[PDB]
Write a protein that binds this ligand. Structure first.
Ligand SMILES: Nc1ncnc2c1ncn2[C@@H]1O[C@H](COP(=O)(O)OP(=O)(O)O)[C@@H](O)[C@H]1O
Ligand SMILES: Nc1ncnc2c1ncn2[C@@H]1O[C@H](COP(=O)(O)OP(=O)(O)O)[C@@H](O)[C@H]1O
Lengths: 291, 243, 145, 48, 49
């Protein structure tokens, strides 16, 4: 079994969830109507989790407050409306999904097939020492990975690092930012170890964004696995990843060509509104992100 | 016969489940088989004390108007409208959908916030009987489920004593300090508690000391833990975590 | 100070953010990249909330950096992103009452927690002057200048 | 338990057979991922 | 003359058919068959009661 699309939860909750909780509070629909609009606001804002359990807590709360409004309160028939709603379930907590929006240089989105569901964790990097330590200086621009690395993630990181170092001299020899400077890099934890390497395709694009210093094109999530010579490799668990990218409002996505199969197994309504760009050799991705 | 007759006129008043009635009937048959002076007669006569002492059908009636709950909570606890509104919704919903209904609940916060104080205040609100039961750091299973009753010095788990003391079949038990319960290899009481807390299997709880199933279904359990995170997931996932 | 490993990543994150903010702000100083620094976080925080202290950390070092004392009695909390974005922290009500107990008369929180703070009783909110913020640079101009 | 052990009663499954009364019920083992795999006698070996 | 015991070992990639041949030998020689997995066990008492 898989997760659930944002719209999909609406058709679930209006039938298989709302009446059940209505039987938990013992009311009938005659006195405690809940429009669709309340449901779409709920699931779109207040609960971003692949499971339906969290929405189940919310709708419970709303119902039980309605029960209090009936047996002692004023109304003999509570009528929730979105304007009413903030009374019952309080003020909105989350709204601004995907924290950065301008994405200042050297931060890139990256999908991750976490232990439960999928989440659009960002990857970030930055300088850790003055860059022009010596105009003649010849010291390796040592990286420092951080973010609860497993050692396997460490080799993946070093591989991606070396490919970045090679790609620059292959592209723009005059720049030397990577080999001549220290760099801290941070991968947020959450990915299960087996998919750990899958973040790597993001990594190289992070570094390159820092190198020229130009920002990545907005909301272009990506994933992959880098080969130390620009080949990309298949990743696993695609259906969860695609739904997580859907929740965050992503409007483009890039996958290894080897998974052009599995992504098409998905139900057609799930895939509407995305614009995929399958690719195999890494150079391709460079032309679908920056320019 | 003397003790059998005082407990039997008892039996005539409290409405025992018919199953437990016949089970105490065969056990009383054995007591007739057992000697008048034997030390095992003392263990099983004090067993009869623990078993007959338990109310079986005494049913404290509740108030069901929210108003009297308004007052009595206001009589003994200022402010904190969130917790009061929660309890108010609790009574308001149980009052709607007919019969009394169970649910487990927890309060948590810095020590001395009045947690136990509101517990007892609710106990005298609903009119249920009160009984504290700390379980912070406990390990042995003899204080929760009891002994086998064949061990030397055996005694029934704490619950049998709360029923013996409170005299109602449907009290307000208050387990205390659930978060730090000793969850060891020596028979984990915290796992053992699930039989208490199972909504359906509490109705036919049984313990090794007194074999006869008890029927806790009317009890309104309450549990208190300082922090919700340490409690193991299977126990933590059922109950609501009020703050 | 009885560091948890999560405090080790948080510390390096905040440290590198200091090193970048100096070079972007005041190049003439070079104290951070050219000197060792001992830092001590007294124990008491439970591990799950551990990162919430981190936003305090960077301002500690900065006080040493420019060397001016911080503006008086300015408690704060938050969560740092390694590029100056800030994140919500949890359990704010206990924190704010403790700040009330201490005589605090200003406070700084991530803007994402503008919701929970309004649940508080009105008497709690009298006499404070809160400063919601998202990017870290804001905080830099509300302490030093 | 052995039934010679004090307090022994048959394992949970037998209670299901006594209660459910069929020879062919639908057992639903839950949350296999978190099975206690310890030095104290691994139940997960016992389940095989 | 008489029947005799002996030890043997097989090894190779999983799913090559090892265990499957075992039973075929069992009905070849006519001896009774009996599987006994021992992967990952540590209670020697299980091997000896
Ligand atoms: N709103 C309140 N009303 C009455 N008493 C309170 C209130 N808040 C705290 N207390 C006091 O706090 C103390 C704590 O008691 P209690 O809840 O019984 O156990 P615990 O120490 O576990 O919280 C009591 O003496 C009680 O009077
Ligand atoms: N040469 C073969 N002839 C028939 N079946 C084979 C052959 N090789 C493998 N198999 C099949 O492989 C399966 C597993 O083989 P076996 O060695 O018995 O288990 P495993 O291969 O896992 O050790 C069997 O069901 C068997 O039918």
């Amino acid at each position: 079994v898989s997760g659930y699309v944002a719209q999909e939860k609406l058709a679930i909750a209006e039938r298989y969830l709302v009446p059940q909780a209505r039987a938990l509070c013992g009311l009938d629909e005659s006195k405690a109507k809940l429009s669709s609009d309340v449901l779409t606001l709920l699931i779109k804002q207040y609960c971003r989790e692949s499971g339906v359990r969290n929405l189940q807590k919310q709708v419970e709360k709303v119902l039980r407050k309605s029960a209090y409004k009936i047996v002692s309160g004023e109304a003999e028939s509570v009528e929730v409306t979105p304007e009413n709603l903030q009374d019952f379930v309080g003020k909105p907590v989350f709204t601004v999904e995907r924290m950065y929006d301008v994405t200042p240089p050297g931060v890139v989105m990256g999908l991750a097939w976490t232990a439960m569901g999928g989440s659009t964790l960002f990857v970030e990097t930055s300088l850790r020492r003055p860059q022009d330590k010596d105009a003649k200086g010849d010291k390796d621009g040592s990286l420092e990975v951080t973010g609860q690395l497993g050692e396997v993630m460490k080799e993946s990181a070093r591989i991606a690092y070396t490919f970045a170092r090679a790609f620059l001299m292959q592209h723009a020899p005059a720049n030397d930012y990577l080999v001549t400077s220290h760099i801290h890099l941070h991968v947020p934890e959450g990915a299960t170890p087996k998919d750990g390497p899958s973040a790597g395709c993001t990594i190289v694009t992070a570094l390159l964004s820092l190198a020229m210093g130009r920002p990545v094109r907005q909301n272009l999530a990506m994933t992959g696995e880098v080969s130390l010579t620009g080949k990309i490799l298949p990743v696993g668990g695609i259906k969860e990843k695609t739904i997580a990218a859907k929740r965050a409002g992503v409007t483009c996505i890039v996958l290894p060509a080897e998974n052009k199969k599995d992504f098409y197994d998905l139900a057609a309504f799930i895939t509407e509104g995305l614009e995929v760009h399958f690719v195999e050799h890494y150079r391709e991705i460079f032309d679908i992100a920056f320019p | 016969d003397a003790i059998e007759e005082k407990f039997r006129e008892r039996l005539k008043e409290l409405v025992v489940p018919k199953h437990v009635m016949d089970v105490v009937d065969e056990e009383l048959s054995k007591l007739g088989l057992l000697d008048n002076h034997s030390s095992e007669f003392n263990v099983t006569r004090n067993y009869l004390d623990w078993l007959t002492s338990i109310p079986w059908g005494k049913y404290s009636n509740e108030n069901l108007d929210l108003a009297r709950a308004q007052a009595v909570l206001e009589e003994d606890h200022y402010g904190m409208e969130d917790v009061k509104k929660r309890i108010l919704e609790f009574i308001a919903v149980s009052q709607l959908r007919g019969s009394t209904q169970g649910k487990i609940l927890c309060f948590y916060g810095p020590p001395g916030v009045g947690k136990t104080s509101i517990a007892r205040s609710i106990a005298r609100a609903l009119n249920r009987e009160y009984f504290r039961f700390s379980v912070g750091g406990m390990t042995d299973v003899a204080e929760i489920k009891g002994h086998r009753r064949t061990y030397v010095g055996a005694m029934p788990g704490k619950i049998i004593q709360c029923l013996k003391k409170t005299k109602t079949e449907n009290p307000l038990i208050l387990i205390d300090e659930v978060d730090k319960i000793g969850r060891g290899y020596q028979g984990d009481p915290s796992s053992a508690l699930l039989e208490l807390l199972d909504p359906e299997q509490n109705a036919n709880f049984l313990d090794h000391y007194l074999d006869v199933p008890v029927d806790l279904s009317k009890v309104l359990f309450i549990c208190t833990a300082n922090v919700t995170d340490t409690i193991p997931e299977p126990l933590r996932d059922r109950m609501e975590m009020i703050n």
